Design an enzyme around this catalytic site. Structure first.
Site, PDB file in Angstrom:
ATOM      1  N   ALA B  32      20.152 -33.779  -0.040  1.00  0.00           N
ATOM      2  CA  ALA B  32      21.552 -33.550   0.368  1.00  0.00           C
ATOM      3  C   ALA B  32      21.675 -33.319   1.678  1.00  0.00           C
ATOM      4  CB  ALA B  32      22.079 -32.105  -0.194  1.00  0.00           C
ATOM      5  N   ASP B  33      23.130 -32.958   2.440  1.00  0.00           N
ATOM      6  CA  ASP B  33      23.029 -32.646   3.779  1.00  0.00           C
ATOM      7  C   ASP B  33      23.981 -31.430   4.066  1.00  0.00           C
ATOM      8  OD1 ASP B  33      25.958 -33.527   4.313  1.00  0.00           O
ATOM      9  OD2 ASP B  33      25.190 -34.996   3.394  1.00  0.00           O
ATOM     10  N   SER B  34      24.383 -31.193   5.301  1.00  0.00           N
ATOM     11  CA  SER B  34      25.284 -30.044   5.611  1.00  0.00           C
ATOM     12  C   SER B  34      26.325 -29.811   4.521  1.00  0.00           C
ATOM     13  CB  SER B  34      25.510 -30.159   6.988  1.00  0.00           C
ATOM     14  OG  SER B  34      24.282 -30.303   7.756  1.00  0.00           O
TER      15      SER B  34
END
Lengths: 722, 74
Positions: B32-34
């Site tokens: 995942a990312d921000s």
């Protein structure tokens, strides 16, 4: 849950397709083409109650010089100073024109009289002109016929060596404007479809998918133009080349957009794994009421123009409203039907993955940080008002037509030998209760003539006391001939011809009119003719009413749309604030379109916007711009249930790509009209194109979702939530 | 309940619900990312009628952490 209406469209798919195909063959065969109907059913340009218009009729009736507000001027040009040979040619030409009582009501002949010929001859002596009062008001089918009759007579007469003739005037220009508009209709559509075809091909990467979509549009277009032609052919409504051109593009634009929504949502259902039938019903539930809601918006919004006063805007009301309703009916019925048949043969399934990662990421940012984005998007929408201070509307119809049209050709001859105002005279007339053929009254008229001559912007003042427009008894036989064209034949009224310095069409020229009325009135006060009624008419006089008329009714049109569109949205979404936001954000976005359109034309291209541009474009911007918001907001209603913020995010994932493709198609469809010879419509097309381009990329993408997250539950007041 | 939480994470990051494990990290293990984790926290907020501060959103970096937070505050 399968709604009944979609069920019967599903069951009667092929019959529906056949039915509309029959409507497109019964029409276009049993009625003349819409362009032909417009030619036979054109409308007059001057509103029937404008003081300038009725003054023109009053002036003509008293002097027996016809009764229409449609004059035209025949110009003679030669490579050498016009010798007596030209006069022989001129006399014969006038004789023919005076004979045609059907079209040339009366010819104000001046160059044939030595006592006043020098007052019309060019300063170089190489040009002269004569004015005609043609039957039928400006732009009416009779006037166009009359101008052609005059033009044919001028062409028919063999000119002497080195002599040319031209026909000009507001009447001639209006007719040529109509023909140019009709002549360019083919090029507008051919470029529009060709450009749309390329765009849709890239979007879907499937030739078959595009062809069926365009054929749906074509049936949508033909029925839309077909029905309006039926009304026009029956005399129920009046048309104008703007209505014909604007209606055609809207049908193709609105027709394609309704197609994109139908294919767009259905394709998304297939991506989710829905069955062919289930996907079809899913498409209907998510887009049927959106198309109907958006369909009434364009039809309803354009109908508000019927409340405008100017004939240009008034005649857009019914032809556009009726046309859009028909195109919508085809979309809501032929749309799903062709989709079902297309699905039966497996043609509409998506050819590429319907990616939603890009838009969902935008949704996360917007919903998580609504206010910071809202301010940023709101400000960039308002800064389009930076053009308002420098905005300058223009009225010179000459500049917004091709250089080569016959009307402009003659005008070019005029400018080559005369000041630009000499071909656009103003005529001032006053009515008394007694004869004026006495020295006592003559002195009063002379004083009036002197006063007007000094009014700013005035160049020449023809009068019985100024036979040649400059300083100089009236009972002399030659002066009696002059008196026969400046005084009522045996009446109680007199007239003058006023020539400006600088084009009257400029806003400065318009301001000169009120000075004339004031100066004439004060000069008339203190003398027995003080009670004499004053009539003022001419090119500047007409556009004084246009400037006051257009600037005002624009509010009547735009404001009426806000109330009408708001009502349509409110009944659709059944939510108060949601309806306000759907149209509210677009309203605030009108500033961005204002700045962009003005910046491109007035500044970058150095061409001022025609006075029609704002009133005609604003309605479409306010209508189509709200449709995209309606589609997005309607998707919020379905997706909500997991959570307002979650629903907004996933809603933009689905409708994010569909609206962008629909938005660009409409913007490009309206922008393609720039290719028309009628540059006025091109400005209308470009202004709509730029505004809708702005609306789709900022208003729909950031403003509405940001506002949607910010309001929370109240966004759907009074509807219950969760 | 861990089932619905697992379902939501599986959908958002596009991985089957069975693959995700409690000890797995959204960014390091699930990729995942921000913005993905922002969507995770907001979706969990709306699913269970719960609110999270930024101080905690940055703190919840693993499935088990979200499970503990949601179950404790339920």
């Amino acid at each position: 849950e399968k709604p009944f209406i979609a069920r019967m469209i599903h069951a009667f798919a092929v019959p529906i397709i056949l039915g509309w195909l029959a409507v497109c063959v019964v029409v276009t065969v049993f009625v003349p083409s819409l362009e032909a109907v417009g030619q036979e059913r054109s409308v007059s340009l001057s509103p029937k109650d404008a003081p300038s218009f009725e003054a023109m009729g009053r002036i003509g009736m008293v002097f027996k010089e016809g009764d229409s507000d449609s004059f035209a001027m025949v110009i003679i040009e030669g490579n050498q100073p016009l010798g007596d040979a030209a006069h022989k040619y001129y006399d014969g030409l006038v004789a023919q024109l005076r004979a045609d009582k059907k079209h040339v009501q009366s010819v104000q002949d001046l160059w044939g009289d030595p006592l006043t010929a020098a007052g019309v001859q060019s300063n170089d002596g190489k040009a002269a002109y004569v004015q005609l009062s043609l039957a039928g008001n400006q732009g009416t089918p009779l006037a166009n016929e009359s101008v052609e009759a005059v033009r044919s007579i001028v062409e028919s007469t063999p000119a002497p060596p080195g002599i040319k003739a031209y026909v000009t005037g507001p009447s001639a220009l209006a007719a040529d404007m109509h023909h140019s508009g009709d002549r360019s209709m083919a090029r507008i559509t051919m470029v529009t479809v060709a450009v749309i075809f390329i765009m849709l091909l890239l979007v879907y990467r499937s030739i078959i998918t595009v062809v069926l979509l365009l054929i749906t549009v074509g049936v949508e277009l033909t029925a839309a133009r077909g029905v309006v032609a039926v009304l026009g052919h029956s005399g129920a409504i009046g048309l104008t080349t703007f209505a014909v051109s604007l209606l055609t593009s809207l049908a193709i634009a609105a027709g394609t957009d309704y197609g994109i929504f139908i294919i767009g949502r259905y394709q998304e259902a297939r991506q989710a794994g829905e069955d062919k039938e289930a996907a079809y019903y899913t498409m209907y539930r998510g887009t049927a009421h959106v198309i109907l809601g958006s369909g009434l918006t364009i039809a309803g919004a354009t109908f508000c123009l019927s409340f405008a006063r100017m004939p240009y805007f008034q005649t857009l009301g019914i032809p556009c409203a009726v046309g859009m309703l028909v195109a919508v009916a085809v979309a809501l019925t032929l749309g799903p039907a062709v989709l079902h048949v297309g699905s039966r043969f497996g043609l509409f399934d998506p050819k590429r993955l319907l990616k939603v990662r890009g838009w969902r990421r935008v949704g996360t940012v917007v919903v998580r940080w609504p206010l910071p984005v809202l301010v940023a998007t709101c400000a960039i929408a308002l800064v389009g008002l930076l053009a308002l201070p420098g905005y300058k509307t223009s009225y010179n119809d000459r500049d917004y037509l091709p250089d080569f049209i016959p009307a402009n050709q003659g005008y070019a001859a005029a400018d080559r030998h005369f000041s630009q105002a000499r071909m656009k005279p103003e005529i001032l007339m006053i009515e008394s209760d007694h004869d004026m053929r006495n020295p006592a009254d003559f002195l009063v008229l002379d004083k009036l003539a002197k006063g007007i001559f000094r009014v700013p912007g005035i160049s020449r003042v023809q009068a019985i006391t100024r036979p040649e427009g400059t300083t100089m008894v009236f009972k002399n036989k030659d002066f009696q001939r002059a008196m026969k064209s400046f005084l009522s034949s045996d009446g109680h009224a007199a007239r003058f011809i006023i020539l400006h310095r600088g084009d009257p069409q400029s806003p400065e020229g318009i301001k000169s009119i009120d000075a004339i009325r004031t100066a004439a009135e004060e000069s008339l006060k203190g003398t027995p003719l003080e009670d004499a009624k004053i009539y003022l008419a001419g090119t500047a006089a007409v556009f004084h009413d246009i400037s006051e008329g257009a600037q005002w009714d624009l509010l009547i049109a735009a404001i009426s749309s806000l109330c009408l569109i708001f009502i349509i949205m409110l009944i659709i979404t059944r939510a108060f604030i949601a309806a306000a936001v759907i149209v509210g954000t677009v309203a605030l976005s009108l500033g961005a379109s204002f700045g962009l359109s003005v910046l491109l034309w007035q500044h970058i291209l150095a061409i001022h916007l025609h006075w029609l541009v704002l009133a005609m474009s604003v309605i479409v911007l306010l209508a189509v711009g709200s449709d995209y918001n309606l589609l997005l907001v309607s998707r919020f209603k379905q997706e909500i249930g997991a959570g307002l913020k979650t629903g907004i995010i996933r809603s933009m994932g689905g409708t994010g790509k569909v609206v962008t493709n629909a938005g660009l198609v409409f913007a490009v469809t309206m922008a393609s009209m720039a290719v028309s010879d009628l540059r006025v419509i091109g400005q209308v097309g470009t202004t709509i194109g730029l505004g809708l381009l702005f609306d789709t990329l900022i208003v729909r993408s950031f403003m509405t979702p940001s506002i949607a997250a910010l309001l929370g539950r109240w966004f759907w007041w009074p509807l219950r939530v969760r | 309940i861990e089932e619905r939480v697992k379902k939501i994470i599986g959908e958002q990051l596009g991985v089957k619900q069975e693959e995700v494990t409690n000890n797995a990290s959204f960014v390091e293990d699930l990729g995942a990312d921000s913005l993905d984790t922002v969507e995770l926290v907001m979706a969990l907020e709306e699913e269970f009628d719960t609110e999270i501060p930024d101080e905690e959103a940055e703190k919840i970096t693993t499935v088990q952490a979200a499970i503990d937070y949601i179950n404790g505050h339920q």
